Design goal:
4 copies of one chain form a homotetramer.
Chain A (H helix, E strand, L loop, with lengths): L1 E5 L2 E4 L9 E5 L19 E7 L4 E8 L4 E7 L9 E4 L11 E6 L3 E6 L2 E7 L6 E8 L10 E7 L6
Antiparallel strand pairs in A: 1-12, 2-11, 3-8, 3-12, 4-5, 4-11, 5-6, 6-7, 8-9, 9-10
Bound molecules: a molecule of 3 linked components (NAG-NAG-NAG) (4 copies).
GO molecular function, one term (chains C, D): carbohydrate binding
Pfam families (chains C, D): Gal-bind_lectin
InterPro entries (chains C, D): ConA-like_dom_sf, Galectin_CRD
C-alpha cells in the first residue's frame, strides 16, 4: 500500500513485508547542497530506515552531504550501530527532480536503488521482517528531500 | 513526476499536462465519516482541483460526506462555480485504506476514477492546460483523506 | 492476461473484455513499406479486429500502407462494412521497433493508441462486449508487423 | 522490448542485457501433464535459455514434468553441462492460465520467478552478458507452454 511518511516519524506497514517485497521512498525534491544548519550533532545526516517488530533497524540508509556518501548499516533496538558500509554519494541522484530510494528484499540481502538504478547490495545482519519505516534527520537540519515522502510497498506481481 | 500536496495548498506541475496526461491523487487514509466539526460554511467539503495557468479550475472534484456525493465542476478565475455534476459517494472508495482519485485526460473530457475504477466522464468546460493542482477544505473541518497527498503525473506506459 | 495471436487467426479472450478494459496488440517488428506483392484484392490491408460473441466486428483497425491511413470501422457478422473513419498513417509508427496498437474501452467509444500515443477516438456502433480478437491480411501480402502478435488484456488498476 | 520466441528457435536480444535487466518469458497456455510422446531421449524436457555471444548457455531453465522439478544449469558452448540445481515443480504454476518465467539479473546471480513469485536464485557460472534467448524441447515431445512465447526485456525503471 501507500503511506505518507513525515520527516521525523515512523509509519507502520499494514503487514510485515513479505519475501521479495519492494519499498519505494519518494520525494518531490532533491537538494544535494549540505544543510545550511549543521546543528549540535556535527553530522549532516538524513536517513530512512526499515524496522522490524522488535524495533531493530534492519536497514539504515543515510545520506551524508558533507561526507559525499551513503551510509548503510543495521542497528539493534537500543544498541549501538554495526560497522558502516559506504558508497560515494555523487553520481547517484540527479536524473529525477523527484528522487526515489527503492529497496528490494532478497533472502540474505537488500538491493538498494536510487532513481531505479541499483547502487548497492547490503547483506542482511539482523533477523525479522520489516514492519515499520522511518524518516529521520539530525537536530536542526534540513533534509535533501521533501519533508514528507510517499512510501509505497509493492511486489513484483503488483507491477506486472 | 511525483508531488507532495498539502491540505490547503497548491502545487505547480513541472510543465503543462500534455494530452492524455494522467494525474493520480494518493491518500494513505480514508475516513468517510463526515467531519465531526462542520464549521461556519455549513457544507462538509474537501476537494482536489486541476487548474490552468490563469487560475481557472478546469476540474473540481469535491467529496461531500454529508451529501453522499461527489461534486464535479469548473470555476473560472474570480467567477462563480458552474452547474454541478454529481454522482453518489457510496460504493466507490468502499473501505480500501489508501484511496486514490485518478484523472485521465481526454481531448474533450476527463475520465475520473476512484481506486482506479472509472466513476464518471466529465465534459471539459474551460480552455487551457492543467498547470497546477490543489487540495482544499472548508474552514474548520477535517478531511476524509490524509492531510498530505502524493500526486503523481504520468502518461500511459513509457 | 496474455494471448498468442497468429496472422490469419482469431483467438478467444479468456473472458469478455470488462468496462474500461485495455487490449494491447504487440508486434516485434515494424515495416511500413507496402507489401511487396499487392495481390488480387488490389488493397494492401493488414488488420486487427475486436469481435463480440455473435461474430460482429465491434472495431476493425486496418493499416493501409499504400493509402497512407488507418481505417476504422465496425462490421456486423455476415453483413457489409459501415462507413469508414480514416486518419493518416504517417506520423504514428513509430518510436520503436516493437510497435503496439492499444485499445482502451470507454462506455460509448474506443480510444486507439499507436505506441501508447492516442491517435483516435472511435464512437461505438455495435452492441456487445469484445470476446475475441483477430489478426488478418489480404491474400498474398506480408504484414507490417510480426506474423505473431502478443495480445495482452489489462485494466487501469493492474496496471 | 518485445520479441516473439518460437519453440525450437533462438532469438537475438536488441543488445546485451545490462545490469539488472529483466527478462520475462510469457506463455498463453499451461499444461503440466507429461508430454504424451516421450521420444528417444527418455527425458521429458522443455527449456528456455539465456545465451551469451559465444553461444554459452549462461542459464538453462528446464521443466521436467515426469521428475517434478525445474533444472537449472549453465552449459559452455559445445561442452557438457555442469552440475544441476533443482527445485520442485509442483506449487509454482497453477495460479494463472498464462504462465510466465521471469529472470531478474543481479551481479552474481539470477533471480528466477514463476508467475512473478520468486522461486530460486541461481549463482552465475559462466562469463559474458546475455545476448540471445532460446526455447527448446527434446525430440518428439509437446511443451507445457504455448509453442510461441512473448519475451519482454525490461529494466526496473520501465515499470
Ligand atoms: C569513538 C570511536 O570509537 N570512534 C569514532 C567513530 O565512532 C566516529 O564515527 C562516526 O560515528 C557516528 C556515531 O556512530 C556515525 O553517525 C551515526 O551513523 C549511524 C549509522 O552508521 C546512524 O544510525 C546515526 O544516526 C549516526 N549518528 C548521528 C548522530 O548522525 C558516523 O557516521 C561515523 N562517521 C564516520 C565513521 O566517518 C568517528 C566520527 O568521525 O570518530 C571516531 O573517533
Ligand atoms: C441562488 C439559489 O437559491 N441557489 C441555491 C444554491 O446556490 C445552493 O447550492 C449550493 O451552493 C454552494 C455554493 O456554491 C455549493 O458549494 C460549493 O460547491 C463548489 C463546487 O460546485 C465548490 O467550488 C465550493 O467549494 C463549494 N462552496 C462551499 C462554501 O463549500 C453547494 O454545493 C451547492 N449545493 C447544492 C447545489 O446542493 C442550493 C443547495 O445547496 O440551493 C439553491 O436554492
Ligand atoms: C458502393 C460501392 O461499391 N463503392 C465502392 C466502395 O465500396 C469502395 O470502397 C472500398 O471498399 C473496400 C471493400 O469494402 C474497402 O476495403 C475493406 O475495408 C474494410 C473496413 O472498412 C475491411 O474490413 C475489409 O477487409 C476491406 N476489404 C478488402 C478486400 O480489403 C476499402 O477500404 C474501400 N476503399 C475506399 C472507400 O476508399 C471504393 C474504393 O475506391 O470503390 C467504390 O466503387
Ligand atoms: C556419472 C554419470 O554418468 N552421470 C549420470 C548423469 O549424467 C545422469 O543425469 C541426467 O543427465 C541428463 C543428460 O545430461 C540430464 O538431462 C540434461 O539436462 C541438461 C541440464 O542439466 C539439459 O541441458 C539437457 O538438455 C538434458 N539432456 C537431455 C537429453 O534432456 C538429466 O537432467 C540428468 N538427470 C538426473 C541427473 O537426474 C543421471 C540420470 O539418472 O545418471 C548418471 O549416471
Amino acid at each position: 500500500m501507500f503511506h505518507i511518511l513525515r520527516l521525523e516519524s515512523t509509519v507502520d506497514l499494514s503487514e510485515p513485508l513479505k519475501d521479495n517485497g519492494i519499498i519505494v521512498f519518494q520525494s518531490d525534491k532533491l537538494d544535494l547542497e549540505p544543510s545550511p544548519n549543521l546543528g549540535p550533532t556535527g553530522i549532516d545526516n538524513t536517513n530512512v530506515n526499515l524496522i522490524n517488530a522488535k524495533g531493530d533497524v534492519l536497514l539504515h540508509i543515510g545520506i551524508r552531504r558533507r561526507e559525499n556518501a551513503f551510509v548503510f548499516n543495521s542497528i539493534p533496538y537500543g544498541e549501538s550501530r554495526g560497522p558502516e558500509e559506504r558508497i560515494p554519494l555523487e553520481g547517484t541522484f540527479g536524473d529525477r527532480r523527484d528522487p526515489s530510494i527503492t529497496i528490494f528484499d532478497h533472502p540474505d540481502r537488500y538491493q538498494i536503488m536510487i532513481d531505479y538504478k541499483t547502487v548497492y547490495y547490503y547483506k542482511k545482519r539482523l533477523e525479522g521482517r520489516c514492519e515499520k519505516v522511518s524518516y529521520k534527520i539530525n537536530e536542526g537540519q534540513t533534509p535533501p528531500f521533501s519533508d514528507v515522502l510517499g512510501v509505497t510497498v509493492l511486489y513484483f506481481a503488483n507491477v506486472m
